[PDB]
């Protein structure tokens, strides 16, 4: 048996296109007023982000529709995403170590996966 859980999660940036018409994207972001990164904290089962099958908790949102979000505040990133239109092109990059700082009792294992105790 060949388990996915054993192999490394790619750390390279990826392009994800979410086609959502006029509904929510189906995920939550965490960030700071400082601009220390915008990260996916939660993906809604059955929502557009989930249906893409290409985003996960711990992804940093680098940009939306060409708009650089690496140094965005949580609020301005929210605005950008809500107003991104029906077709939303996200560049994301898996950053579990940076993400783990936000969530209590969380850490990264050898596979690169986020674990909460």
């Amino acid at each position: 048996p060949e388990f996915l859980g054993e192999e490394d999660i790619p750390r390279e940036p990826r392009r994800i296109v979410i086609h959502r018409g006029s509904t929510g994207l189906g995920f939550n972001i965490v960030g700071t007023e400082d601009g220390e990164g915008i990260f996916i904290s939660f993906i809604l089962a059955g929502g557009p982000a989930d249906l893409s099958g290409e985003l996960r908790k711990g992804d940093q949102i680098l940009s939306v529709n060409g708009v650089d979000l690496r140094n965005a505040s949580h609020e301005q990133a929210a605005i950008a995403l809500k107003n991104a239109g029906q077709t939303v092109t996200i560049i994301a990059q898996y950053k579990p170590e940076e993400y783990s700082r936000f969530e209590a009792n969380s850490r990264v294992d050898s596979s690169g996966r986020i674990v909460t105790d």
Binding site: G24, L25, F27, N28, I29, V30, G31, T32, E33, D34, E36, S41, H74, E75, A77, A78, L81, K82, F102
Partner: peptide, 7 residues
């Protein structure tokens, strides 16, 4: 510094 938003 922290906040969380649904989108």
């Amino acid at each position: 510094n922290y906040k969380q938003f649904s989108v």
